[PDB]
């Protein structure tokens, strides 16, 4: 199982919706995929399919589909507060199993 | 009519599929949306819905839908040759009507 995050970095501007791409290369082992900003114990939960309310986040694909492998998310209304590295992380049934390499979100000036 | 490209820059690595996002804020005037790499007379056509064959390119949404406003594309198999600024451009029936601000694709080292 690999957690693929094709984009190392996104440069976004304030107000935009940013899409963070993540794919899994295997449907087993069984477990949820979570999104976090940062690593280590202080990291922030960004999305959990399993449960919770994430009003700024939507999923590109239907995570409840049996053979879904797309864990990409859209985060709306980006502010300077959102800069960081976002990790797509697979858990086993929970304990962390594998993490993606992270996608850095950086903030840029409007054209 | 605005041509929105939320991401100023994508840092991608070799072999990845990169997604270039573009949305139009209006369905009129009538005309096709093309993708180019670069600006000016020397610019390279990257995608044309109207016609042509672009084996490395797929569209995120169905461009033949009446009320489609999503002109985002996926370019597979990125190499250093793909670095540049990609512009989503609306034509009128053709003459260029409006361009997006461009999304730069840069190449990064693998994690």
Curated annotation (Swiss-Prot), chains A, B:
Tissue expression notes: Detected in liver, and at very low levels in brain, heart, lung, pancreas, kidney, placenta and skeletal muscle. Expressed on CD4+ T-cells, CD8+ T-cells, CD56-bright natural killer (NK) cells, CD20+ cells, and all activated NK cells. Mainly present in the paracortical T-cell area of lymph nodes, with only sparse positive cells in the mantle and in the germinal center of B-cell follicles. In the thymus, primarily expressed in the medulla on mature T-lymphocytes that have undergone thymic selection.
Disulfide bonds: 22-88
Residues in Ig-like V-type domain copies: 1-102
Subcellular location(s) of the protein: Membrane
Subunit details: Interacts with CD47.
Task performed by this protein: Probable immunoglobulin-like cell surface receptor. On binding with CD47, mediates cell-cell adhesion. Engagement on T-cells by CD47 on antigen-presenting cells results in enhanced antigen-specific T-cell proliferation and costimulates T-cell activation.
Protein name in the entry: Signal-regulatory protein gamma
The encoding gene: SIRPG
């Amino acid at each position: 199982l690999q957690m693929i995050q094709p984009e190392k970095l996104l440069l976004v501007t304030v107000g935009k919706t940013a899409t963070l791409h993540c794919t899994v290369t295997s449907l087993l082992p069984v477990g949820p995929v979570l999104w976090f900003r940062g690593v280590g114990p202080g990291r922030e939960l960004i999305y959990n399919q399993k449960e919770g309310h994430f009003p700024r986040v939507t999923t590109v694909s239907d995570l409840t589909k049996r053979n879904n492998m797309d864990f990409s998310i859209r985060i709306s209304s980006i502010t300077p507060a959102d800069v960081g590295t976002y990790y797509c992380v697979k858990f086993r049934k929970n304990v962390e199993f594998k993490s993606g390499p992270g996608t850095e979100m950086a903030l840029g000036a409007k054209p």
